[PDB]
């Protein structure tokens, strides 16, 4: 171990001694008597022009770039877990392994939560083996979990209406066309009621329809499905006060 | 006041929730057509506002769906989903971060969670490399890592002529003798003779 | 027209106040960013 | 110990002189901004 | 140390003398005749290994002792600091005779520097994936190639594919580029009436 | 006047060696030998030199050789003439949605190499195809999945006629299940010159860039709008005057003046700035999927469309209603609506009338009124000359 | 006429403010141009 | 304004013509032409300087370039006069001289 560490230290020293004299800045400087280290030809012959190839500061290709930092980080961090473990890096985030280290990925400032949205929707697409439009169709009608159904065209429409006509003053002015509009439809405009949510709210619950509608709105039967206040508040995203 | 045609207004009213019978239920494509009809009637400010709001709604839809359907069984909250996926799904859409910085933050979060053994089974022999012995001081952030690597490659940037690890007592006494606001040639030559 | 030119010269006066406020803020910020001087830290170490 | 104590006093006097000069520099920049501002106020008074 | 302290106290004509005691680009007059060197220190002329084992701790003085070329480069950067602060102290006085002195100092610094490396840079990068770039096999092969380089390995002349394609490239240092940028900015402001 | 004589003269293969003496002095085309000597001779930066010249130097250390979506490839042994091959990528539909880059590199004559990299790989398709404008599959390899972010090289045999005319290679990933085949296509167009005529054309192009300060892609677009084969002429100089005069007259952009000066909406993109087409249509992506200028018919009467994607995209990109879009199209054809193909040649001159309303601070209804009381009542704006 | 004379007297007030701002700037500048005094430099040398 | 603009245009015409036609072969840029002729051809026309100050600046630039041996062949015995031993501190500028 000590001999391999000494070999690695002297390899780094020889590389530093080679590259620190082949600097393109230190060529045309007057009366700085610096010779190259007499192994520059050997370095360029072993590694094909690496000492011949110096890069601009602030580049993607640089050894002090965030791409180099990320490369060293992933190379040293990809071994904390066994490969079959579900907490392994490539298993939990296969996107981060195949990231192309380019200047566009380095400098193109995209907003976060767009990456989160693309990652979640790509994982849902890879899970359910469908397209993005099919994922939105299934998410517009999913009733099993809380905070869902999510009708994305309906949300786009109601946010467009809320941006254009805030507080619904056109409804108050134009009463003869307000006659044609339904009060529950205007409720669905002013606050979020998806069409699937309206179907959930409007259906009646008989003792006959009980076990079927419990499957349709929860999945599992056998009423003890929450067993605790914490699971209920976590399923519906409620506080203890709201619960 | 909606910025569309009265035929578009009639198409919106035809998406009534409860109305006349024998009209069919509004299809998802019908809702998408009404959505792009209202969506084409906005300027760029309202379009960016609507887009940010739709992203901030679809994240809390899709994260709950991913927690329910496809996830390891330990994940039960959005914070646990963040702790798994290493990307924050609760950040509002005003925050911007490039892809390499997101990957850097994700791997740094994974390392800081694996070092405290919060995960399943951390491989203890990998934990004691030199890169992780220097994790707490140098390798945790890009700025200190790049500073250490620059101190390796170009030490000329970091040498000051005043302080140095290992300078002698005569050097320190010279520095005490030399640290004034006024330095004459006679003063510095007497200090050099001393 | 002369009223509008008076407004312009008043705006010039306001800019020349803002420049000095800016220089004072920058000088106090670069004073604050170095807590002790090299000589001040040296005197601390010599007392120790 | 007495010699390095009085060396600490010497470097302290040097640094307090430097801080006095920096404060005078602050005052000079403030007064120069002030005389520019009053000159531009004289200009807008001539326009009025 | 004496030159750095005289620069901080701005005794310029003595600071340049104490820099002449180590570096003179104009040679040295010894017994009336000129000399063939420019560095007044013989372990700076011939690079003497002051410090074997320098990377046991992070010390720029230890690396610059392991090879004194970095001390030589830092001395040149101190000379550039002296010249551009002479130019700045001449420029801040705002008299047209002092502007010629300021342009003289900036021209002297520029002709000490030479030509800025502009077209010799690469701007050339076969962008791999992170999975390709963090290949531990490739990194080990690179270190094995370095060991073959120092053991000279007979240079096997079997022209194979470059398996080290995803290697990051060396970067020129930031401080000299900052000197180049501030020198051309000074001369741009001086070549106008700014 | 001497610069105008330099710009206005035509360069024949006969007049080549004489005009090279008249504009350079020495013959024997290798007179610069380096980027540094060229930039020093013309007082250019490396960035400004990179707008024109992107040689085959330094090929092995990259997988993308195209700079500013163009590439010159001079070949030796052309009877010692050193003919150059300028190839310009044009970035057609689904380029940014399905792949990183897609470059067509010539190896030899009738011997071309397709370099690309699929972004976001699709495991369930496997049927690689490659056609040109939906004519014939050039390359077709069933059971092959291009994995994500990987530089693949595919040999392509292409005729000189097909490459000198503008070709549009179309990368496919069809699935054997009858579901969706992911389309992604880019457009290429090569130009070949002998070395002396190439040097003279590059000389006068760089001199025009130095004189006017206008973009080289912009002068490419205005010379493509009038002529073919890149002949700088007095009509090109007049149109180049008029884009500058409109850009100073109103506060329009360069491409906004281009649309007004009888050019099309530019699809030229860069890593610095996106294309004007994707800025105008797809920067706030409407339903996630992008807009692609397909030749898909759409009747612009306000009730008979039922293709709401392109309709909402056009209405948002032109900031217009259905009725106002219909009367905008009716003004473009003199009060009639023959057929709307949703092509780029219709989106330009649909956008021209909207710009004509907007730069004079008029609504489209006011523009229809003012043209109804003009001597331009039922005239054909689609059939106008540049002078008209 | 009396309005115009009021403008004149206000301009006189502004000039008399500018004169004192000028004297303060000149005094701070001649304070700043000598960093240490002769006695201050003497005391530094005596401490040394 | 027109005269200043015409001077600032004719300098970058005439300097390029002088570099092309009549110059030593080493001169290839405007900075090299400045380094040769010892007068700056890139200065915009707001700057004023008398003829004796221009000649003083030219000879001082020539001396500071010859001392660092940037030129062709500097005569080393002339370099060690007392006037150039006192160049760095006294004789470089007119005020200290």
Residue numbers in the entry:
A (entry chain A): 50 to 292
B (entry chain A): 875 to 1068
C (entry chain E), G (entry chain D): 2088 to 2135
D (entry chain D): 2185 to 2232
E (entry chain A): 1797 to 1990
F (entry chain E): 244 to 631
H (entry chain E): 923 to 1019
Quote the study on this structure:
Tc toxins consist of three components: TcA, TcB, and TcC. TcA is made up of a central, pre-formed channel that is enclosed by an outer shell composed of a structurally conserved α-helical domain decorated with variable receptor-binding domains (RBDs). Cryo-EM structures of Mm-TcdA4 and Xn-XptA1 in complex with heparin reveal that the glycan interacts with different parts of the shell domain, including receptor-binding domains.
To address whether heparins/HS bind to a different region in other TcAs, we decided to determine the structure of a TcA from another organism in complex with heparin/HS. We chose Xn-XptA1, because it also shows a strong binding signal to porcine intestinal mucosa heparin. Expectedly, the obtained cryo-EM structure at 3.7 Å resolution is very similar to the structure of Xn-XptA1 without heparin, but clear densities corresponding to heparin/HS are present. However, their position differs from that in the Mm-TcdA4–heparin complex. In particular, a docked heparin oligosaccharide interacts with N1090, N1092, H1121, D1582, and S1584 of the neuraminidase-like domain, Y1548 and S1580 of RBD B and W1663, K1665, N1674, R1677, Q1678, and P1679 of RBD D. Since the RBDs of Tc toxins are not conserved, this binding pocket is not conserved as well. In the case of Xn-XptA1, the heparin/HS binding site is closer to the membrane (ca. 4 nm) and is located in a cleft between two RBDs and the neuraminidase-like domain.
